[model samples]
Target: SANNPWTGFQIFLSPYYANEVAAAAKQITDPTLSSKAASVANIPTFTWLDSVAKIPDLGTYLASASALGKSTGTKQLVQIVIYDLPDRDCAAKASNGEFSIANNGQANYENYIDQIVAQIQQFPDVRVVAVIEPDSLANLVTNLNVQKCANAKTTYLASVNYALTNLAKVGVYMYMDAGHAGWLGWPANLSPAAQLFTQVWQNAGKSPFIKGLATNVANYNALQAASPDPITQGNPNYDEIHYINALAPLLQQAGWDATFIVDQGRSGVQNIRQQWGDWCNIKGAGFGTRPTTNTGSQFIDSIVWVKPGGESDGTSNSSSPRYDSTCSLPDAAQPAPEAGTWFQAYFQTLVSAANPPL
Candidate 1:
């Protein structure tokens, strides 16, 4: 609890993982490719508890998940991504969460966190690393002009503070999700984002509960691009490291020195998108860095796969209200399913280009 939870620890593949891989494998045409698709079952990726209904999935995944420790001869690291804030993902429709501020979203979000805490409590020995609420604060920084993002500002700030305060009680190593560099790393936006991050951390009493910030939860950004990726042209935060390094000092000056975990699951192949913000299920993206603490920067805890690689980012159907134009972009993979569901073809694509070669 005193140090990085990921160090010398192996991340767990929950009971749900095998089924996910098997489903994708069945759809693969080539037997060789089918076998490789199953290889990801051995990789460690975070489980996302994105809705109230998904809370029980935590208990289910953990009950059997922790049993791996004995087999692996290493400590089991349970990485869970906590999402589902009221009016969540305000900037984009593809991932707009279940809760709305109108229908008990504020009150329900608290209950949602409480249920997750209860589940974690039952597994006292498990080391829990939570990437808390992606796209919350980042929207507050850039999307306020959009009325929904502006309207949800108070609840977004309040809910994050509430989550930070309460989840700490159970000793969850929390990482507040900061949007990737292209979003917040801009020169004009960095200080404002830092100030906003400071406010949230301070409001939560700035405890050790929040270990640091999580960047690029489900997006594609290199940990270190050979050069600036063209989509992010003119933005110095061409990759996550530059953004993290630059933001580290600003947070320190604001009286909070924190660490980070970058998501590399779909970032293995970059520059495939037309725009910098095209996040949903892009084509030709191989799985990126595996979870490891060997990150060059001391500020990083581990470069991890926060988003389950095979899951669809959004439904491809244009008629769906949840649809976003970004999801339909030429680079975004087609014939995908709804958000969080498995996309068989896309899963195969991810395996073919895995940076570590599966």
Candidate 2:
């Protein structure tokens, strides 16, 4: 059996990057160089399962999970980002999901939930970690108006509660969304966000199945307090650790035993220049930490790569797909690709400049 370096936490590495490295290795003639490249080929990365278009059907996901588990000699632990809420990415154009409540949103979401549960049920032995509805919950607290609906709040809560009830049935370790250090990390929003999460949890019967909270799913906020708060005033401790700690009390009060899984894939960068908080494949970003159960802090279960580093957040100049102002910032990387497409230049930058040197 392969020894899990993540210390009991399940780390799901996308065979996608491994294959990319392997193909690149075959083209190199030098023996020593090829050997090094071959080793790099197997480095594990978290696979993304976007609900809208990227994820495969349930059978495919099960088959893939089984194969990966067999190949690596480790449990097929996958981190699936359950995006595609009705008014997805309320304030941003980059990575806006398909399907909205405006058109059969409730029924569509219910169907989506049923499909996910059915698929995971097929792989009963495989451990599945679902990062439930990334931007859905946070938007209700911070960007509801941007979602363009009066019923958005009500719908969001209902969908989340429904998902919690259904997904919990199959013993999936569920983690709900807690935006990032930049948004809910501030003092003002911390309690409200926690309270809201508690309400959703209770509303769903406080299922023991909903394990914890997921932070920085697709955002570029650093895991540590490396710099001052960019957007918040009077609050300086703007990092994942502080954010989780501040939000802990409220969750505890609500009788919720909170844990966290933070996204560090693009958070390796030490700084950002724009006041607007450029989120579209920002330059200088790199792979942060590998997935691990030992976060050193009790609040966080692991820091995994929820957002694959190289994928485009969205295009900077167009709203055809979805127009987010952050994508157009001067510091934002130019010639950006659309959401989910691979950005080779951005990928290269991430690997080369990785803070801990991946």
Candidate 3:
């Protein structure tokens, strides 16, 4: 286990310079709201490498990160989501992957990682932290009931192990995505989930760089909820803190020193969802904690903005194959664009209602 890269390091605000901030800022016509949008934009957030097509874009963000480090004199870090597993997002339709293992998905994904590592090497000064494969291993636990998820189980496990091993070689601090409370926080789901994680860690030779778990990647889960939301009240793992406390020990028991990073990106408001499981362009959501290592618990490495605030979780268009019903739910924002597309209205909500107040 190397020193926590997040320690004494400032997170690089990639979107600010990447035209995410520029694109969102341009559409806000109101003067005051435009200022608030800029405030939200200035904060550091993780950039997702969600597809093989997006891999080449990694160089741009790394260059920006290196520039930011030069300004501050403090070591700068970039949190990149290493998404794009074969048949990824098995349970959810919103973010189905472009690569499929049967059709050159293996070749392309390897190329994707190799290309990204090349970018990381180009910027030797910038530290790296990777949130690996959201919903991939977690889906293997519960959604095996879905045939697609069942079919992809072996490949998912093998692929993540490959990712964990390779990324560690390049000295990337890794955190495997552990699904939040509503899904694996229950009695039956807990042990098996830990077992699955342990299996992967063992197969990968248990790299010390595999820091711990990343909770609440793009979902709304409180850092610590005072009381459980009605929908998930029965499950004691009702928030991200609870999930970390419950799961960390099990991972440690399996000989992995588990430290966590909670994505409080859209968790500024809570108790608003009618169904605890609905994840999309959530209405009434706001930006939560900025990237910081001042976590009260040592187990929590930091609270990060893993999901960019304004990006729609999924397309609201029912006709699209990528359409997930959750995006169409009453709790979801209306007229939302496709997943990863900029949503100006949603960006306004996050800025105005931001918990710590943007």
For all predicted structures, in order, the TM-scores are 0.95, 0.87, 0.95
Runs in model 2 lying further than 4 Å from the true structure: 1-10, 17-46, 52-58, 67-73, 93-95, 147-150, 226-233
List the lowest-lDDT window of 10 residues for candidate 1.
Answer: 1-10
Question: What are the per-residue Cα lDDT tens digits for candidate 3 across 1-358?
Answer: 3466687777777764347767776688888878778766578788888886776667777788788888878788887999998888888765668889788776767777788887887888888999999988999889989988998888788788878888888889999998888888776788998999988888888888888888899989898887888878678778878777788788889988788888998999988898888888889998887778887776898898898888888888998888888898999998888888888899888887888787
Best model per TM-score: 1
Local distance difference test, candidate 2: 0.71
lDDT for 66 (candidate 1): 68
Scored by Cα lDDT, where does model 3 land? 0.83
Writing each residue's lDDT as its tens digit, candidate 2 over 35-68 gives 6545544444555555644555444655777777
Clashing pairs for model 2 are none
Clash pairs of candidate 1? none
Candidate 1 per-residue C-alpha lDDT over 1-358 given as tens digits, one digit per residue, 9 for 90 to 100: 2388777776777557778997788788889888988877877888888888888888876676567776667677688988989988887865558888999888999999889889988887678899989988899998889898999999999898888898898988899999898999887889998889988989888888688899988989999998778898888778999999999898888777789999998888878878888888898999898878888897898898898888888988899888887778888888788888878788888998888777
lDDT (Cα, 0-100) at 275 in candidate 3: 88
Q: What are the root-mean-square deviations of the candidates from the true structure over C-alphas? A: 1.7, 3.9, 1.8
